[PDB]
Amino acid sequence: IVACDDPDFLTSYFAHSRLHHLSAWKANLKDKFLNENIHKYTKITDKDTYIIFHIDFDCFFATVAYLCRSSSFSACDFKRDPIVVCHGTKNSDIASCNYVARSYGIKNGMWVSQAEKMLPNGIKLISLPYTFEQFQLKSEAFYSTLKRLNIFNLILPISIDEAVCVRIIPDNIHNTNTLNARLCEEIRQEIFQGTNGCTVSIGCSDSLVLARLALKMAKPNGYNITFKSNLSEEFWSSFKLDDLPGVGHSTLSRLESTFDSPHSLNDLRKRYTLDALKASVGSKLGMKIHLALQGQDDEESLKILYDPKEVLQRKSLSIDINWGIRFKNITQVDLFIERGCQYLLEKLNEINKTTSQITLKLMRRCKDAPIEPPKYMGMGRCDSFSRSSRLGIPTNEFGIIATEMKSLYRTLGCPPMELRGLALQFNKLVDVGPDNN
DNA sequence: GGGGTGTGGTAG
DNA sequence: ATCGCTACCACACCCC
Ligand SMILES: [Mg+2]
């Protein structure tokens, strides 16, 4: 048990944190892509007609945790039993759940406590531990398999278990549904074999946005092919409003108030006008939804196809620790900030780049929130405070950055005992070049 | 036309 | 117990 004033805390937290793991795995895939395309111009161009194959493991952690489960769980049955992956028994996040679990209304991000109430009497919830290293090995087999198929002109990592795979179509070839259905089936069988039993679903279209919706429609363990040509009312009626890219709970809520609670993308499509939509959720998001409702990608999302090296290139660097934060005095806060800065500078020197602007953000207990929140070591209900600082010269010097970071903390005025969360960010990065005179 | 900062949504 | 990250965009509002 590692307290936040222990020099080992960051290492233990990050080793246990599935969200940290997902972020680092994602950054590593993006750097790997860059280091492999330092010479290629494998880009998509305006002259290219292309098909999108958007691929994603089904209930990834739960599948892998099951395939690699310990002998204590030998008798657990992935097709019969409700299965979650999590650390604990109560206010512990469900990181993944199998489709047995989901059939009872369990969803990712639920606490185990809430999930247990959703089961009928007599049905027991199976809780598997994380298998982080094997999560990564299955991801290697995934990406290895996609490259070996030699059917994609461009392979874009979205995450450890999800990729957007681009196939250029010569106008010498006439596109058909049967041919894309056969590719989908090959991809699914080769990944199933290559990962020793994980399954993927696949959305296939002539736009990124349709391919992502088709993928949602295709789950679980299936595929769906919906081109712009094939759009119909049954397609749009299949999706909730927050299935759209960039529509979360907050945008969802605004769309409902504005348009009298549409219950499907079809309802939204029939009621909206671009004007009122921009007024509801903003000019850029509104245009994006409007484009999305015609099955069309926006200019921003298309850049990943025409310039993936620039899209995937890292523009900032940060850590966020909003769990386990309980400090008694300012001395312990300063030491934790120094540790965070050290960690971040190891990451910064890995990619050979200086930083010109830093930010400290923190979470502070709401004046009326309990000192000890419902979730053990959780941040609870908090107010956010943030402040940034331009560095004179771009630097990687600990003495400069750490001092400024500790200074930033003092400017935000948070008493150490009220602190519940800390983010440390390098907001602008400058390349290091061969001439340093 | 350019530049800025803090806050906050979303993704996956 | 329990591991509530992190990159990126968009906004409201401010300066010249
Ligand atoms: Mg959404």
Distance between CA atoms of residues A54 and A327, nearest Å: 45
Q: Would you state the structure tokens that stand for residue A254, as one six-digit string?
A: 């605004």
Distance between CA atoms of residues A220 and A322, nearest Å: 33
Determine contact, residues A213/A226, Cβ cutoff 8 Å. Answer: yes
Residue A203: strand, helix, or coil: strand
Q: Would you state the structure tokens that stand for residue A322, as one six-digit string?
A: 């909003």
In one-letter notation, the amino acid at residue A250 is S
| C-alpha of residue A157 to centroid of ligand 1, in Å | 19
CA–C1' distance A71–C8 (Å)? 42
Place of tokens 């769309």: A255
Distance between CA atoms of residues A58 and A223, nearest Å: 11
Q: Is the C-beta atom of A248 closer than 7 angstroms to strand B?
A: yes
Q: Is the C-beta atom of A108 closer than 7 angstroms to strand B?
A: no
What experimental approach yielded this model?
Answer: X-ray
Q: What is the CATH number of domain A8-26+311-431?
A: 3.30.1490.100
Q: Is the C-beta atom of A158 closer than 7 angstroms to strand B?
A: yes
Q: Would you state the structure tokens that stand for residue A320, as one six-digit string?
A: 């966020």
For A34, A142, A289, A410, A432, the CA distances from A145, given in Å and listed in that order, are: 19, 5, 34, 51, 35
- N residues, chain A: 437
Distance between CA atoms of residues A409 and A236, nearest Å: 48
Chain centre distance of CA A149: 26
A220 upstream amide cis, omega within 30 of 0? yes
CA–C1' distance A376–C1 (Å)? 6
Query: What are the b/e assignments for A329-354, b being 16+ CB within 10 Å?
Result: eeebbbebbbbbbeebbebbeeeebb
Within 10 angstroms of residue A275's Cβ, the number of other Cβ atoms is: 10
A31 is in an annotated binding site: no
Distance between CA atoms of residues A266 and A390, nearest Å: 47
Distance between CA atoms of residues A10 and A28, nearest Å: 19
Residue A97, beta-bridge partner list: A84
A98 is in an annotated binding site: yes
Distance between CA atoms of residues A166 and A305, nearest Å: 8
Nearest residue by alpha-carbon distance to C1' of C12: A282
Determine contact, residues A141/A194, Cβ cutoff 8 Å. Answer: yes
CA–C1' distance A229–C13 (Å)? 44
| Apex A265 CA angle, A184 and A217, nearest 5 | 20
Q: Would you state the structure tokens that stand for residue A29, as one six-digit string?
A: 């895939």
Within 10 angstroms of residue A29's Cβ, the number of other Cβ atoms is: 19
Pairing mode, strands A200-205 and A419-431? unpaired
DSSP codes joined into one string, A132-181: HHHHHHHHHHHHHHHHHT---SEEEEEETTEEEEEEEE-TTS---HHHHH
| C-alpha of residue A130 to centroid of ligand 1, in Å | 26
Q: Would you state the structure tokens that stand for residue A242, as one six-digit string?
A: 């927050």
Q: Nearest nt (C1') to A389 (CA)?
A: B5
Distance between CA atoms of residues A198 and A145, nearest Å: 13
| C-alpha of residue A242 to centroid of ligand 1, in Å | 4
Q: Would you state the structure tokens that stand for residue A60, as one six-digit string?
A: 């990834």
Distance between CA atoms of residues A293 and A230, nearest Å: 14
CA–C1' distance A210–C13 (Å)? 36
Q: What is the CATH number of domain A60-132?
A: 3.40.1170.60
Instruction: Give me the sign of the Cα torsion angle A415, A402, A26, A132.
Output: negative
Report which DSSP code applies to A129: P
> How many CA atoms within 13 Å lie on the side-chain side of A42?
17
Residue A45: strand, helix, or coil: coil
Task: Report residues near ion ligand 1: CB below 5 Å.
Answer: A 242, 247
DSSP codes joined into one string, A62-127: HHHHHHT--GGGTT--TTTS-EEE-S-SSS-B--EE-HHHHTTT--TT-BHHHHHHTSPTT---EE
Distance between CA atoms of residues A145 and A130, nearest Å: 24
Distance between CA atoms of residues A214 and A181, nearest Å: 13
Distance between CA atoms of residues A378 and A3, nearest Å: 13
Determine contact, residues A100/A85, Cβ cutoff 8 Å. Answer: no
Place of tokens 């028994």: A89
Instruction: Classify A282 in phi/psi space as left (phi over 0), alpha (psi -120 to 50) or beta.
Output: left
CA–C1' distance A278–C15 (Å)? 27
Q: Would you state the structure tokens that stand for residue A160, as one six-digit string?
A: 């450890």
Element counts in chain A: helices (H) and strands (E): 17, 12
Report CA dihedral (A219, A222, A226, A231) to the nearest 10 degrees.
-50
In one-letter notation, the amino acid at residue A81 is D
Answer whether A8-26+311-431 and A60-132 agree in fold: no
Question: Looking at strand B, which nucleotides approach a protein CB closer than 7 A?
Answer: 4-12
| Element (DSSP H or E) covering residue A11 | helix A9-16
Distance between CA atoms of residues A363 and A404, nearest Å: 19
A139: nearest Cα among A221, A14, A22: A22
A435 is in an annotated binding site: no
Distance between CA atoms of residues A155 and A301, nearest Å: 16
39-98 on A, CB < 7 Å from strand B:
none
Give me the phi and psi of A238, to 5 degrees please: -85, -15
Enumerate residues preceding breaks in chain A (C to N > 2.5 Å). Answer: none
Distance between CA atoms of residues A412 and A401, nearest Å: 17
Determine contact, residues A420/A363, Cβ cutoff 8 Å. Answer: yes
Chain centre distance of CA A308: 18
CA–C1' distance A412–C16 (Å)? 28
The structure was resolved to a resolution in Å of 2.0
Distance between CA atoms of residues A334 and A99, nearest Å: 46
